Amino acid sequence: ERELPIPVFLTEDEDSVHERMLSNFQDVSTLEGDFIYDATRPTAEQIAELKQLGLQNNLKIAFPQTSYGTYLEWLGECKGVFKNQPTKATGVIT
Amino acid sequence: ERELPIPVFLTEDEDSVHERMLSNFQDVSTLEGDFIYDATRPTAEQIAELKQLGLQNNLKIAFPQTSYGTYLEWLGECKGVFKNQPTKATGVITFTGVQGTIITKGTIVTTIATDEKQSIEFELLETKTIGENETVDIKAESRIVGTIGNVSKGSISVLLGSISGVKSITNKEDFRGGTDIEDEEHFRERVLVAEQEDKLSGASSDYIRWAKEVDGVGYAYVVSEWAGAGTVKVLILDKNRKAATQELIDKVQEYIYPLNISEGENRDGKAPIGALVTVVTPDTLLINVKASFIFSNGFSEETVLNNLKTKIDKYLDKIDLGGTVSYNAIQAIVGSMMLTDEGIEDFSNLTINDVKENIKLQDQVVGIGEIVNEVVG
Amino acid sequence: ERELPIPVFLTEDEDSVHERMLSNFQDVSTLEGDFIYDATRPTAEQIAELKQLGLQNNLKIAFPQTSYGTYLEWLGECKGVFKNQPTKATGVITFTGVQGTIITKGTIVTTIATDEKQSIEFELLETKTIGENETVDIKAESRIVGTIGNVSKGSISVLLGSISGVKSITNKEDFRGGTDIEDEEHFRERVLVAEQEDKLSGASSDYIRWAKEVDGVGYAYVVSEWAGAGTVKVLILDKNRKAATQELIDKVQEYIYPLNISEGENRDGKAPIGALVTVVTPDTLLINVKASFIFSNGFSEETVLNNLKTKIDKYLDKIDLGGTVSYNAIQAIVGSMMLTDEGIEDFSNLTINDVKENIKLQDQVVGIGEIVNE
Amino acid sequence: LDEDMETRRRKVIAKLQSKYIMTPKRMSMILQSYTGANIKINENISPYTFGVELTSTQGFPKDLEDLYKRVNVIKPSHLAVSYKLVS
Amino acid sequence: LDLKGSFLFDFEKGEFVKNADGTLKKCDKVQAYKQWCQKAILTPRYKKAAYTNIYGSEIKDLIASNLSQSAKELEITRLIKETILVHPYTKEVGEFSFNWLENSRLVEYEFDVLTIDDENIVIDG
């Protein structure tokens, strides 16, 4: 199906977020196993995860090109489209 | 680490030993505090302590699965695996003072000892004089091996003695030469990892396996006696088919065939004795496309060409080393945008590096070149 | 198995410990029934017992030569040896019944339970319906790994659970596989072999090892530097230590050093790159022994001679390529058959190639000769 | 038993360590451990030979043949060997 | 139980103590617990939204209270005791003392007891 060309800044890497996180510090060890690295890595993990799972998926379901559920059905409704319903099989018993 | 099964005998209870000892007596009393009890109980207690502590510890140090310390090292020496050793922090210290002042090698300068922290001792590796400029820099080293040291930029500020004329001693940049003793469990892993049975000769299959072990090696190829004398070429492609970078080449080179061995050293790489090895990567052919492109109304020529450049490059990624470039398929890659009206209004004289036929790579990978609009007069 | 020659002081007698115990006392009755003797004897009992059961067993399990349990497995691990695991037996059940009757994979079908045997159960490995001829062949495994799975044919005629339509079931084949855990005895030799074997790679022994890995290669001998630097020769023999067949040479050639080449597969043999390996069969110099053998009861002379042939054949492996065949060593092999009571009671007049002299190979391999009773 | 204990130790340690690739590092220490004297493998210039250079402050006896026996046994079968001894 | 260590923080300077390496100075479980106790006392309850209702104290709010001196002493004991005891490592806190050194300016002491301070019975069958 069609793919939504998301901008790169909306899909930053976790490490890129973490690297930009550590940029502020100046006179403290920012190495792994340090308080600064260890404390900030979960924040980068959540920030990247929210950016990807939150915004991109939220933006994706908005458009019919990348919608799957009732959101797609609502989008199909707005332009008059309706999903076809199931039906019973039929026939004759002798 | 693995838990140590222990024989039942070595884990006997103290009372069980004492009970067996008193089994033979049946005439004289054996009550606690009785003389027979006095004679026998310390022996039983001493046996249990020695049996449970001394003997079990001996069993523990026997195998590398549970050995430790010097004992684990020697089992490493059984199969010729040595644990890494620590190093002293190394760096430079800036000095300021009277120009006539002279600073000698072996001088000791430390960090600021405090109630919370003790001072880290460092020794100067050089003798210098301040005669020319008030500032001089002297190489120094931590007197203690390990990551102790590796201090921050301005940490070194203490001189144990007092040198005449010196105005200020300050380290300029953080030290980096320190490294600790290798972890026992990591070393225990190394001892147990080194247990391969065969496939160690250094054939083409062995060299390919060794090349693949290094990360970033997607594919590897071997040439036997490319320069005679048992020389071996190792042609490597990265994970994405591409030519391995120089750093990756050096890593694979150093992993299999170190080149920095000094006089008192020998190669530790996977390459056996007398098997000369060299790591190579093929040449990336650039496909410069030339055609008289015609673009649609008001669109950006640079944008459309860049998009076409991306489309062709994606196709080029599918090609392998020594593959065949499909010129006729590349016509449709340009023509793909025509069908979708993605900028290209028309094109002519479609060529790849001024060629109108499928090109066969030979010891070469293919990458996107320069997209050039002919603009023929 | 190998025994550990423990020092005597590490195996003192209880009484010797007790006697040394009583040596200190000077002015007290040290006789049995006295406080000194009675009180000290349990100490000597424990000291001797700890010395034997504690130290000797502790020292014994340290080495693979005298290890039995997980300690042996750990020792085998350190040199790359691993005990073989059990496996399920397998084979085919010929079903019979109404065509269309459904039988599922995983159904439990057993042998005939008896007073002396429980229902040795099996598990169907395939879901299938009965075929055109009111039959269908379904493969099945043994639920229990080990030799119990390897039941005979026709034994599995029992289906567990209420399923109609199936008329009968049977195993046409005595099932195969069904390996149990490797024994300590087998595992110890493999650990001992790995411990003793150098297990290098690229040396002559490995070339011999690769040659012997090829089927039909009885004995292999390798000459380093036969034609200078970079040159290796391999000299193989059949199971009878005679001249190896050319196909065997071709098989070993393809195994270790193919002459044909390819850009990707330079040689892809077991030998290293840069080697120049030659594969041939050596000159088989027979050494036929003749002696006045005298044979024991409960043995066949021809069988005993073949056993002596095998023993001397092993000694020929001990004899190096181009080595010296020792008459004294052959006396050892012949007499050891007598000391082992292996069908020989006496022997005399032994002559190797009708001479009582040590024979020197001229860069050849001695071939196994005919043993003659004089 | 009559042999030197240190000689027996050196033989054993070299014997155990012979179970991996014959890289110049491993080969050097195995021969070094067996002899007890420092050894440097030259990786000789000739096409299929490797050089060995030994160093000891105390010198050597006049007999060192068994070292060459092990080297012949231990070396790759397609490589020759050369030696030089230094005090 | 397996309480874990934490990182020093000089309350006098209001900064973390860091080694010459630049890494923050780690410290013991017991040191961490003492670090935690002072922080919890200084953290007012219900106001710093990061923490739940368990954490923090209410000593500051007691200053504006109109309760008598003796009533305020008991409230101080209750508040300090409640705040500290939430930590698993605490065994008991008590032996409170008070000294109204001026007319209306107070100094008070209290003693904390760890889990490790307990006394163990020595017996086995």
| DSSP characters over C131-172 | -TTSEEEEEEEESS-SGGG---TT---EE-S---SEEEEEES
CB atoms within 10 A of CB D86: 12
Beta-carbon separation of D73 and C203 below 8 A: yes
3-class secondary structure, B40: helix
- Look at residue B154 and give its three-state secondary structure: coil
Q: How many CB atoms lie within 10 A of CB A58?
A: 9
Q: What residues of chain C lie within 8 A of the CB of B65, using their CB?
A: 74, 77
Beta carbons of E24 and A31 less than 8 Å apart: no
* Touching status, chains C and A (3+ beta-carbon pairs under 8 Å): no
Instruction: Give burial (CB, 10 Å; 0-12/13-18/19+) of C130.
Output: buried
Nearest CA in chain E to B112: E20
Alpha-carbon span C92 to C95, nearest angstrom: 9
Per-residue burial over C63-90, b if 16 or more Cβ lie within 10 Å, else e, is: ebbbbeeebbbbbbbbbbbebeebbbbb
* Among candidate residues C272, C284, C275, C271, the one with its CA nearest the CA of residue C211: C271
How far, in Å, CA of C27 to CA of C8, rounded?
Answer: 31
Contacts of E20 in chain B (CB under 8 A): 111, 117, 120, 151-152, 155
Kindly state the tokens that stand for D18.
Answer: 């012979």
Amino acid (1-letter code) at residue D87: S
Greatest pairwise CA separation for chain C in angstroms: 102
Query: Which residues 6+ apart lie within 8 Å of B2 measured at CB?
Result: B65, B66, C74
Q: Do E20 and B147 touch (CB under 8 A)?
A: no
- At position A79, the amino acid (one-letter code) is K
- CA-CA-CA-CA dihedral for D66, D72, D74, D80, to nearest 10: 140
- With contacts defined as CB-CB under 8 Å, which chain C residues touch B64? 78
CA-to-CA distance for B131 and C143, rounded, in angstroms? Answer: 90
From B111, B117, B152, residue closest to E22, measured CB to CB? B152
Contact present, C363 and C233 (Cβ < 8 Å): no
- Rg of chain A on CA atoms, in Å: 23
Which H/E stretch holds residue E70? helix E69-85
**Chain C residues whose beta carbon lies within 8 Å of the beta carbon of residue D48:** 228-231, 274
Sorted by sequence, the CB contacts under 8 Å of residue B229 that are 6+ apart come out as: B276, C274, D47, D48
Q: What SS3 state is found at B38? A: helix
Residue B142 in contact with residue B175, Cβ under 8 Å? yes
Distance CA B365, CA B240 (A): 11
- C225 φ/ψ sector (left φ>0, alpha ψ -120 to 50, else beta): left
Name the residue type at position E53: N
Q: Are D77 and C201 in contact (CB under 8 A)?
A: no
| Phi, psi (degrees; rounded to nearest 5) at B261 | -65, 135
| Tokens, residue C248 | 């065997």
| Residue C10 exposed, middle or buried by CB count within 10 Å (0-12, 13-18, 19+) | exposed
Classified as helix, coil or strand, C207 is helix
- Distance between CA B31 and CA B39 in Å, rounded? 12
Nearest C-alpha in D relative to B196: D20
Distance CA C353, CA C361 (A): 13
- Residue B340 to residue B336: CA distance in whole angstroms: 6
Helix (H, G, I), strand (E, B) or coil at C367: strand
Please judge whether B111 and E20 are an interchain contact, meaning their C-beta atoms are less than 8 angstroms apart.
yes
Q: Which residues, 6 or more positions from D59, have their beta carbon under 8 angstroms from its beta carbon?
A: D87
Of the candidates E79, E74, E65, E81, which has an alpha carbon nearest to the alpha carbon of residue E98? E74
Q: Which residues contact A20 (CB under 8 A, 6 or more apart)?
A: none
Chains B and C touch (3+ CB pairs under 8 A): yes
CA distances from A16 to A23, A24, A27, C9, C367 (A): 11, 14, 21, 70, 73
**Cα diameter, chain E:** 60
Q: With the CA atoms of C347, C351, C356 and C357 taken in that order, what torsion angle do they form, in degrees rounded to the nearest 10?
A: -130
Cα B326 to Cα B319: distance, rounded to the nearest angstrom: 9
By CB neighbour count within 10 A (0-12 exposed, 13-18 middle, 19+ buried), where does D19 fall?
buried
* Cβ-Cβ contacts under 8 Å for B295 (sequence gap 6 or more): B301, B304, B343, B344, B345
Give the separation between CA B31 and CA B37, rounded to whole angstroms. Answer: 6
Choose from E4, E9, E18, E23 for mutation: most chain A CBs within 10 A.
Answer: E23
Token couple for D75: 């070396």
Contacts of D75 in chain C (CB under 8 A): 203, 224
3-state secondary structure of B364: strand
The pair of structure tokens assigned to B217 is 């090696």
Distances (CA, A) of B189 to B78, B180, C64, C79, D17: 15, 17, 21, 14, 18
**DSSP H helical ranges for C93-233:** 184-196, 204-213
Distances (CA, A) of E103 to B43, B344, C363, E100: 72, 93, 115, 7
Question: Which region, left, alpha or beta, applies to residue C322 given φ > 0 means left and ψ of -120 to 50 means alpha?
Answer: left
Q: Are D10 and D33 in contact (CB under 8 A)?
A: yes
Q: Which chains touch B (3 or more CB pairs under 8 A)?
A: C, D, E
- Distance, in Å, from the CA atom of B293 to the CA atom of B93, rounded to the nearest integer, reads 63
Are B315 and B352 spatial neighbours (Cβ–Cβ below 8 Å)? no
Instruction: Please give the Cα distance from C7 to C1 (Å, whole number).
Output: 19
Residue A16 phi, psi dihedral angles, 5° rounding: -60, -40
> Closest-CA residue in chain D for C225?
D78
Distance separating alpha carbons of residues A64 and A47, to the nearest angstrom? 26
Q: What is the C-alpha R_g of chain C?
A: 31
Q: What is the resolution of this structure in A?
A: 3.4
Buried-state track E55-93, b at ≥16 Cβ within 10 A, e below 16: bbbbbeeeeeeeeeeeebbebbbebbbebbeebebbeeb
Nearest CA among D83, D63, D62, D61 for reference residue D71:
D83
E21 contacts A28? CB cut-off 8 A: no
Question: Dihedral, CA atoms, C310, C313, C317, C319, nearest 10 degrees?
Answer: 140
**Beta strands, E only, chain E:** 6-7, 26-27, 90-99, 107-114
Q: What is the DSSP letter of B109?
A: E
Instruction: Dump the DSSP string for chain A.
Output: -------SGGG--HHHHHHHHHTS--SS--STTSHHHHHHHHHHHHHHHIIIIIIIHHHHHHSGGG--SHHHHHHHHHTT--PPPP--------
Q: Are D68 and D37 in contact (CB under 8 A)?
A: no
Per 3-state DSSP, chain B is made up of helix, strand and coil in percentages (nearest 5) of 30, 25, 50
Indicate the burial class of C114 (C-beta count within 10 angstroms; 0-12, 13-18, 19 or more): exposed
**DSSP label at residue D43:** -
Query: Distance, in angstroms, between D37 CA and closest chain B CA?
Result: 13
Q: What are the structure tokens assigned to B126, written together?
A: 């050089």
Q: Return d(Cα D85, Cα C345) in angstroms, integer.
A: 56
Q: Could you tell me if A11 lies within 8 Å of chain E, comparing CB atoms?
A: no
Asked if the C-beta of E21 comes within 8 angstroms of chain B's C-beta atoms, the answer is: yes
Question: What residue type is assigned to position C18 of the chain?
Answer: H
Q: How far apart are CA C313 and CA C331, in angstroms?
A: 14
Separation CA E125–CA E120 (nearest Å) = 16
Angle, vertex CA E103, rays to CA E102 and CA E107, nearest 5: 45
Q: At what angle do helices B204-213 and B246-256 cross, to 10 degrees?
A: 120
